[PDB]
Structures are given as C-alpha cells and as structure tokens.
C-alpha cells in the first residue's frame, strides 16, 4: 500500500529544473563553489519555506491568491507568485522545444552531432569518431550553429528558427490537449533508469575524475562572492516549487490531516539526491571533454543555458546503439517538462478563476486555458529567434532567479511577525498532531530572513553586469532584467496602495492594523 505512495513523491522530486538547470547553474558559479552554498541554503531556507507553503495552503484549503485571507493587505504576495509562474511558463516551454528538436533529430540511422564532416562544422572541430590552437566538440558546434544559429547580440534577431517555431506549436498543443483530459511505476522509474545509463557512461570515460573533482572539491576563495549565494538561494527555491504558487494550490486540494511534514522531508531529500546525481553525470562528461579539447574543466564549455544540450548529446554518442538511447533520453526530458507544465498552467488558470468567481468563467475555463496557451506561444516567439538563448537566460537568471527568494521571505515575515508565529505553530499542530520542530521554528523566525536579507544586501553592492560565455550583456537588456526581476516583487507594495485606499480607518496606523489583521 505505502510503497506505491513513495514513487509519487520521487516523481515530483525529478524534472527539468534539476536535470537541465541545476548542472548549468553549478557550472556557471563553479563546481565545488556552488555545492556548499546550495546545501546550506536548501537545508536552512529551502526546506522550511517548502514545508510552510504546503502547511499554509492545506490548513486554509485555499489557492495562492485566496490563502492571503490571513492578511488581506499582503495578497500582493499571492499576485506576485502568478507573475513568477507566467515568466517560467513561457520560457520553460522553449526548453521543451529543444528537447523535441533533439528527439525528432535522433530519428536517424546515425546521430548527426557525432561527426565533423557536416557543412556547419568549422576547421576548429575535434570529433570523437573522426588543425587549430582552439578546439570545439561536434555537439558544441551542432548546437551553436545548426540547432540555433546564434547571433552576435540580442538586437540581432535575424529570422526565427522555423524548425523550433514549429516545435513551439507541438509543445503547446501537447500540454493544452492534456489539460482538457486530465502509471506511477513507469513515470517514477523511467527518469532514473535512463539517468543511470548515462551516469555509467560518464564515469567510464577517461577524464571523468578530473570532472568529478571539479564538481565536488570546494573553493573557499570563492565562497565570499555574493552572487554565488544569490544563484544558490535561487536554485534551492526554484527546484522545490517555492514562490511559484503551485505548492499552495496543489496542497489546498490535499486532505486537512495529511502529514505534510513527512511529505516536505521526503520530497526535498530525493530532490537533492537527484540534483546531485544529474550534476554528477554532467561534470563527469565535462571531465572527458576537457582532455579531449585540451582545455581545463573550468573552461571546457561555460555555457549557461545549453550545457545539458552540449553535454548529454555528447555522452549519448559514445553509448552502443546510440540512436536508441537518445530517443529514450530526449523523450524522458519531454515527458518531464510536459508534466511540470500541466501543473504550472492548471495552477494558474485555477488562480485566475478563484478570483473571478465560479459563474460564467467555469464555462470559459477551457477558452481561458486556450487563451493562455495562445498567449504563451506569441510571447515565446522572441525565444525561438536567432537570439534565443540570450533572452532565455535573461528571464532565467533575472526575472526568475532571486525574486522567488524574496517573495517566499515576505510571506515568512508577514506570517511570523504580523500574523503571529505563536498562532501559526498552533495551526500546524491542529492538523499534524505535533508542533513544528525546533529546527523549523528558529529557521522561520531568525535564520532564513537574516540569510536572505544579507545575501540581498551584498548582491546589491557586489553588482557587476551579467555574462553568458564571456559575452557581456548591454545596458538596455539587463535594464529589462531588472524590470522583470522587480515586476513580480513590486506586486507586494502596489497591491497595498490599492488596499489602503479601499479599506476603512481614515488614519495612519489604525487603517494598517485593520488591513493587516485576518
């Protein structure tokens, strides 16, 4: 009975957030330099905020908007979580488009990214199955020149990648047609059996130890850089589902007396165990690419986005019966993304509808779901452009990096000091039987808001303009980065300006004490 209930939690702990994004972030900030900040931020700030977002929505039994009844003034937090969801939903799908592209492109007798013989390849190219000071891998050039003809700047959109724009059709239809309609043994084991095949390959390559070493051995000289913690806080909070709103929405359906403590520990533990295994396989492949290209693991690829699409294809080419495995591997990434998109969009449509109220919009619930899909496609067009990954990063490491950390922390402040920690710990006890552990009680009131606060302060000070593979972003693109990153966070103060105008009191402090109380 209880064994089948384990695989459900295992399935939520694997997805594109840690198979694609975790290795790229771990590499961008540097192998062992990100692992120590990641575990610290996940244990002290990630898991307690995760358990709070489950408990908050399951107790109240209301979604990310309606749950802000505990303090009607702070409902701007609930709106902000939808903004984070709307940025993630439109870019997360172009990642699925590229998983579809490599999947369909794997439908051959010979994988194309294995060889230097193809026209797009330069004289630099190295080849694993087949000249210059600098060397490039077949996969690194197939990606960079054939899959996406990457331009020199954001402004240079050139012309849309028609094969990717076609896939952006399929990747929106395939989730939409599932939202109308909507097996745990296959969907929970298949991601791990295929990741184990590539893991075995990654370790058995020469140079794998030099990759693994870089991944694990820490950099105490780099642990005093604010952004290393900023990206480590972002990843811990992104990978669990915090500040998207979906955790409050899914747990609202959940039974009142469900043991959400047993859930938050089990989900977050097998999430870390899978994050480390997905990094482990990538960095072991990079260790092989290092000696092969004759450049250090610190310098072998250094892509932000695309690192999964430069390294997993390359590992796949050395497997026997290689096309068979690439079909299963990219198909796996596809079903992983479609599932998290079904939950991301179902959450969002339900949250529009909760506020509009049931009459009339429950007939329209499919025509708004269709409207959402149409909008995400039209807003996903600059991402299928010739400047695709320049924008994909600008959302992923500005609009959706750190904003998840402040939005889930303002929730912690407004619950702990304004609603009352004393009241809240008693609410948890009514549905669990036991109170919140002493590790969580102190984490919520002191460790998490101070850590999140200090990281915010030093990141504002140690500000330097962002780079993708030694290309610096222009002033006007990172300005849009700021505007998106604070577009979701400003939902908190802006909704309060509207609330204090509507609410009664006609005074400085009493109108706030009226609006802030439940």
């Amino acid at each position, epitope marked *: 009975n209880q064994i089948e209930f384990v695989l459900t939690s295992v399935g939520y702990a694997v997805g594109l957030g840690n198979v694609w994004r975790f290795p790229y972030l771990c590499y961008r900030n540097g192998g062992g330099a990100f692992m120590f900040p990641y575990f610290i931020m996940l244990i002290f700030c990630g898991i307690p905020a995760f358990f709070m977002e489950l408990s908050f929505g399951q107790f109240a039994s209301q979604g990310c908007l309606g749950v802000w009844r505990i303090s009607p003034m702070f409902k701007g937090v609930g709106y902000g979580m939808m903004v984070v969801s709307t940025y993630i939903g439109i870019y997360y799908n172009v990642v699925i488009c590229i998983a579809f592209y490599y999947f369909f492109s794997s439908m051959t007798h010979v994988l194309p990214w294995a060889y230097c013989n193809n026209p797009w390849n330069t004289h630099d190219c190295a*080849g694993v199955l087949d000249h210059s000071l600098q060397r490039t891998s077949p996969s690194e050039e197939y990606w960079r020149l054939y899959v996406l003809k990457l331009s020199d700047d954001i402004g240079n959109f050139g012309e849309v990648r028609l094969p990717l724009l076609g896939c952006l059709g399929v990747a929106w239809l395939v989730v939409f047609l599932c939202l109308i309609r909507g097996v745990v043994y296959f969907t929970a084991t298949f991601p791990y059996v295929v990741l184990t095949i590539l893991f075995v390959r990654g370790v*058995t390559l020469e*140079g794998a130890f030099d990759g693994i070493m870089y991944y694990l051995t820490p950099q105490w000289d780099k642990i005093l850089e604010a952004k290393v913690w900023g990206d480590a806080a972002s990843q811990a909070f992104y990978s669990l589902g915090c500040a998207w709103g979906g955790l409050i929405t899914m747990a609202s359906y959940n039974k009142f007396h469900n043991n959400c403590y047993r859930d938050s520990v089990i989900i977050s533990i097998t999430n870390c165990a899978t994050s480390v295994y997905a990094g482990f396989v990538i960095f072991s492949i990079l260790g092989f690419m290092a000696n*092969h290209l004759g450049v250090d693991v610190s310098r072998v690829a250094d892509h932000g986005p695309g690192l999964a699409f430069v390294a997993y294809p390359e590992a796949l080419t*050395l497997l026997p019966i290689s*096309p068979l495995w690439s079909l299963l591997f990219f198909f796996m990434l596809i079903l992983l993304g479609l599932g998290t998109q079904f939950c991301l969009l179902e959450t969002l449509v339900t949250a529009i509808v909760d506020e509009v109220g049931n009459e009339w919009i429950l007939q329209k619930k499919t025509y708004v779901t269709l409207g959402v899909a149409v909008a995400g496609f039209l807003l996903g067009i600059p991402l299928t452009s010739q400047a695709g990954i320049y924008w994909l990063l600008l959302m992923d490491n500005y609009a959706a990096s750190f904003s998840l950390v402040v939005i889930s922390c303002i929730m912690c402040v407004a619950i702990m000091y304004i609603y009352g920690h004393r009241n809240y710990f008693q609410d948890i006890q009514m549905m669990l039987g036991f109170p919140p552990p002493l590790f969580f009680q102190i984490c919520w009131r002191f460790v998490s808001p101070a850590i999140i606060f200090f990281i915010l302060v030093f990141t504002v000070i140690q500000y330097q303009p962002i780079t993708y593979n030694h290309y610096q972003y222009p002033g006007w693109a990172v300005a849009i980065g700021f505007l998106m990153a604070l577009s979701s966070v400003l939902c908190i103060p802006l909704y309060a300006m509207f609330r204090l105008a509507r609410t009664d009191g006609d005074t400085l402090l009493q109108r706030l004490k009226n609006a802030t109380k439940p």
Partner: nanobody
Amino acid sequence: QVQLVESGGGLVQAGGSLRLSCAASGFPVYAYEMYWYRQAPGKEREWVAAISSSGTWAGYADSVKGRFTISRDNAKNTVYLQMNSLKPEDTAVYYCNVKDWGASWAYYDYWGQGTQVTVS
C-alpha cells in the same frame, strides 16, 4: 585510418606468464573500450577480456577471470593484457579488438594482427 598492432606473445611452459601489448592509431582511442579475443586452431573465437575508456571497470571470460589482468595507458594509446598462470588450453591466436558503433544501430569490428601464445 584505424590501425591496431600487437607484441609480446610466443612460446611458454604450463605455469608461465606473458604480457600481451597493443598500440592504437588513426583515431582517439582514449574514448573507446578495448577488447581481447582468442581463437584456437580450428575452433571458434572465444572472448577473453574487455576494459573501459577510463579503466575503472574490466570484465573477463569464465575460463580466464583472475588468472589474467587487463590494463591500459591512454597516454601511450595502448592496451595490455597481463597473462599469468598459463595452461595448455590458452594456446590460441590473441587478437586486439574495438567495436566502433559510429553513432549508429550497427557496429564495425576493427581487429589487430593476431599475436600467438603457445603453452606447452
């Protein structure tokens, strides 16, 4: 392109030991898995050993395991099969091998010259 050449065979008594060597050129061997086979006169090709690109895992046939020890050095582009506690049944032509899939559904067997080992 692919060339495999061997050395270290010959004639020995039962209870002796020999260290077959193989050098590889025309392709990046450090990313390939090397195999060794033996075919006794008139009899078919038996398997003997196989080694990983890194050299973490190696596997041996049931009539060989623990008597012999495969090893490689990817700096020299060489694979070696150290043979110990040899017996009259080990009298066969020993062939260095690599199976190139070509990122395809089928594989091409590249072979060495075949170096004899004869055990009195």
